[PDB]
Design a protein around this ligand. Sequence first.
Ligand SMILES: [Zn+2]
Ligand SMILES: [Zn+2]
Ligand SMILES: [Zn+2]
Ligand SMILES: [Zn+2]
Lengths: 76, 72
Amino acid sequence: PPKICLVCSDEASGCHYGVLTCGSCKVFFKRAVEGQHNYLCAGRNDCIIDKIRRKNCPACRFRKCLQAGMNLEARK
Amino acid sequence: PKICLVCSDEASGCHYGVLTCGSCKVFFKRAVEGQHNYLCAGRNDCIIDKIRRKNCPACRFRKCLQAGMNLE
DNA sequence: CCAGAACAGAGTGTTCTG
DNA sequence: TCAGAACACTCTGTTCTG
Ligand SMILES: [Zn+2]
Ligand SMILES: [Zn+2]
Ligand SMILES: [Zn+2]
Ligand SMILES: [Zn+2]
């Protein structure tokens, strides 16, 4: 049965930083947590984040990472 | 003075028919030539400003067209 | 199996030129 | 005048490595 990234709904590769995610959201989260952490949404902070649109809004992608429970300590 | 009609950034001059910055100038050219299928993650109403213009090419491109940008 | 590094490509914006 | 080239920099996602 299918394993689904809890952030962008792409096929998940495994449990990364505590949450079932794809490889691209894994490394996106690590980069967001180590980066400028100044993200702006051009929308309403509800942007659709899927395989097609996840590049559009780093702010909403990162919000969904946090909301899903991702953390660098990789606590479940 | 001198404001980009697309993203509100300081405008360099009149490009492809409209007063725009350089980033919007080259973005528009790249978009017209460049095949792309742009899709808004929003409502097709995105805020386009100096930082936010990067987020939504679809809305940036739409504003470009609606402002009258033309390859001549 | 998973974190992190490394690699390569896409996207963006500036500088320079005539 | 502004269009184009091209350089330089950021963001992304897959493949490697430990
Ligand atoms: Zn994902
Ligand atoms: Zn958003
Ligand atoms: Zn602009
Ligand atoms: Zn949009």
